[PDB]
Amino acid sequence: GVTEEQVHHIVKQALQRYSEDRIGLADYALESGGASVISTRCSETYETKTALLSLFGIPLWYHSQSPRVILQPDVHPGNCWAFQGPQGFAVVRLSARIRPTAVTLEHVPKALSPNSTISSAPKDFAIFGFDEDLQQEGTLLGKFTYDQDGEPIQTFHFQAPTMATYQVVELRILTNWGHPEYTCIYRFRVHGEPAH
Amino acid sequence: GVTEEQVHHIVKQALQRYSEDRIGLADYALESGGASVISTRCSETYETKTALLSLFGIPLWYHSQSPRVILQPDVHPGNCWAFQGPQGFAVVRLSARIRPTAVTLEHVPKALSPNSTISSAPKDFAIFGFDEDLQQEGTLLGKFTYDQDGEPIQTFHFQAPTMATYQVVELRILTNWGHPEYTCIYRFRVHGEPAH
Amino acid sequence: GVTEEQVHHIVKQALQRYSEDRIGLADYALESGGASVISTRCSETYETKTALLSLFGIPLWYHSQSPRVILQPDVHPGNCWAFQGPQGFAVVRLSARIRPTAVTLEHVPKALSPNSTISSAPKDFAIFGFDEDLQQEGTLLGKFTYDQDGEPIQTFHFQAPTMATYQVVELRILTNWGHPEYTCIYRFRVHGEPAH
Amino acid sequence: SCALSNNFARSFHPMLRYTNGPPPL
Amino acid sequence: SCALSNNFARSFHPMLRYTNGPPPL
Amino acid sequence: SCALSNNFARSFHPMLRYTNGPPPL
Ligand SMILES: [K+]
Ligand SMILES: [K+]
Ligand SMILES: [K+]
Predict the structure, then answer these.
(1) Helix residue ranges per DSSP H, chain A
(2) How far apart are the C-alpha atoms of C62 and C50, rounded to whole Å?
(3) How far is CA B34 from the centre of its chain?
C-alpha cells in the first residue's frame, strides 16, 4: 500500500529524470555543449536527391542531413545521419577531455517508424579513443550491439574501462539491422569523468 | 492497494508513451519523415507585418509562419500557420501511400494562451483523399470538430474508413472558435496502414 | 491505499502539467508569442572566438549566442546568453501589456553540467517595470535570488505586487554563483494578468 | 478557381517537396 | 551612460521587434 | 586510406569546430 503522497514523489522524480536529457548523465559529445564531428573517414553519405527546396517553382537546393546531427538532440523520424552500407564512422572531439565510462546510442522508436520496424538502425558497433590526434592508432574502449527490440535509447557501460582520458573518440558502426541501402544514426552521446 | 513497484511500471509506460510523439502513432504527415504541404489552394496567409528582423537598426525582413509549420513538431505559442477567415486549406503529400485511419490535430493549450482562451483554433474541419493528383475530385474521409474544451492534442478515428489508400490528403478548416481575424493551425498529423 | 485508477489519473495530470511549458503559466516574455529583447544596456557579450563555422576548410564565421536566446525554449547545455562579469541586463518588451505577478528563471541542471556545478548561473537579480519607454526610471517589482541547490526551473512570485501594468520589463543580474569569466542565462519568463 | 489556386506556390516561403521517394529514416 | 547603451543594437546578432502588435497565435 | 579520408571535410555541410576551448554554458 502506497500513499497518494508517495505516488506524487515517485512521479516528481521520474519527470525530473525525464527532463534531465532522459537519462540524467552529462553528455560530452553534445554539440551545443562544445563537441563536434571532426571526421567521417570514408563514410559515404547516402544521398537520395529527394528533399528539394524551391521558390516560385524554381528548384534551389536538395536538403540532406549532416553528420553533425548525431550530436543534436532533435530525434524526430528522419532527423538522423544516413550513410551507405552497414559500415560507417564518426570521429567526435568531446567538449572536455574525460575518462570515458559509457556511451549512449538511440534510434527512432518502432512505434513511429513505418511498418513498425527499424532495419536502418545500427546493430554492432565499437568505440575507440584517440590519446591526441585522430591519425595515431585508436584504442578500443568497447564493442556493443544496439538492440532493435530494446528501448529506443540505450546506454552502454564499458566493462573494466581503463583510467586513460580522451578528448577524441570514434564511433564505428559495423553492421545494421538489415536495411539494404543505408544506416541511420539518430543520436550518439558520450559520458564519463572529467580531469579532477 | 498498489505496490511501489507497480507505480514505477505505470510511470515508466506513461513516459514511454509520452516520448513516442505523445500518442504513440506514426505520423505520415510529419515533414522530416518525408511529407510536405504541396498546396494551400486560395488560403490567404494572414500577414500582420509585425515580426521585423533588423541589423544595426536596418529593417531587413518581416518574418511570418509558413504553411509548412503545420507538419513540424514545435508547437510553442505562435508557432502555427495563420490564415485569414475561418475557411482554409492545406494539401499534404504523405510520406508513404497508406490507408488513412485517423488524423490528429492540436492547438496551444488554454493555460498558455492569453486570457486562457483559444478562439483562433480550428473548429469544424474535414479530411479529403486524392487517389492520384490534387485536381481530381477529393473523396471525403471524415468530418470532425476540434473541441476547444478538450485536450490540446485530439485524435480522430474515421468511422467506417474504406480500404482505399492515398498519398495526398487535404485538411479543410470550415469554422473556427470565434476569432474575428484568423485561424491558427499548430500541428496536423495523419495515421494509417501502409501497403502490405 | 491508492487504486491503479487513481495512479493513472495522478500521472495523467502530472504529464499534462509537464507538457504545458512545465509550470502551466503563460509566458509573456516568450519570443514566438510576440516578445523581444529590445536592449541589453552595456552588457558585454562574452565572446570566446571558439565556435567556428567552415566549408572546404575555409573559416567562415564564429557562432555565438544572441541575447534573444533567453526568450527561446531550447535550454540544452550551452544554449544560454553569456555576458562578461556577474552584472548584466536585458530589457524585454512583453507580448502584451500585463500586470506582472511572477517571473521564472531556469538554468541547465547540475546533472548535465560538467563537474556537476553551475557557477555560471545567475544568483541575485532584480526585475524592473517601465510604464512606457525604456529611458524613464524603472520601477522595482522585485529582488530575488536564483538558488543553485534548487530545481533547475524556479518561479518567483512578487510579494505584494502593485496593480500597475507594464509592457517593458528589465531583468538585472547582480551576482552569479562564482564563475570568474561570465554569467549564463538559459531562459527568463514573465507571468501575469492581461488588461481586463 | 479555388481548387486551381496555390498561394503557397506564389510566396516568399520556400517550398519543400520529396521528388525522389522518402528521405532516410 | 549605462542606461543610454544598447550593445545588442550594435552587434551581428539580428534583432527582432514586434512593430505592429502580436503575431497570430 | 580509409583513416586518411574525411568526406565530411569535402562536402556542402558546414563543419563546426571548437578552436578556442568550450563555449559558455
Ligand atoms: K539527431
Ligand atoms: K508547428
Ligand atoms: K534558451
Answers:
(1) 4-19
(2) 7
(3) 16
Resolution (A): 2.3
- CA atoms within 13 Å, Cβ hemisphere of C50: 20
Which residue shows C-alpha cell 508513404? Answer: B96
Chains F and A, touching by 3 or more CB pairs within 8 angstroms? yes
DSSP E strands, chain D: 15-18
Chain A residues 37-66 with a CB less than 8 Å from chain F: 37-45, 64, 66
The length of chain D in residues reads 25
The residues whose Cβ lies within 5 A of ligand 1, an ion, are A 69, 72, 75, 79, 187
Q: Spell out where chain A has E strands.
A: 36-39, 51-55, 58-63, 81-84, 88-106, 124-130, 139-145, 153-157, 166-173, 182-185, 187-194
For the four alpha carbons of A168, A174, A178 and A180, in that order, the dihedral sign comes to positive
Report the amino acid identity of residue C148: Q
Nearest-5° angle of CA C25, CA C26, CA C32? Answer: 140
* Backbone dihedral region for residue B11 (phi beyond 0: left; psi -120 to 50: alpha; all else: beta): alpha
Q: Which residue segments constitute the domains of chain B, with CATH numbers given?
A: 1-196 (2.60.120.260)
List chain C residues with CB under 8 Å of E19.
none
Q: How far is CA A56 from CA A61, B142, D8, D19, E18, in A?
A: 13, 32, 9, 16, 28
Closest Cα in chain F to A138: F3
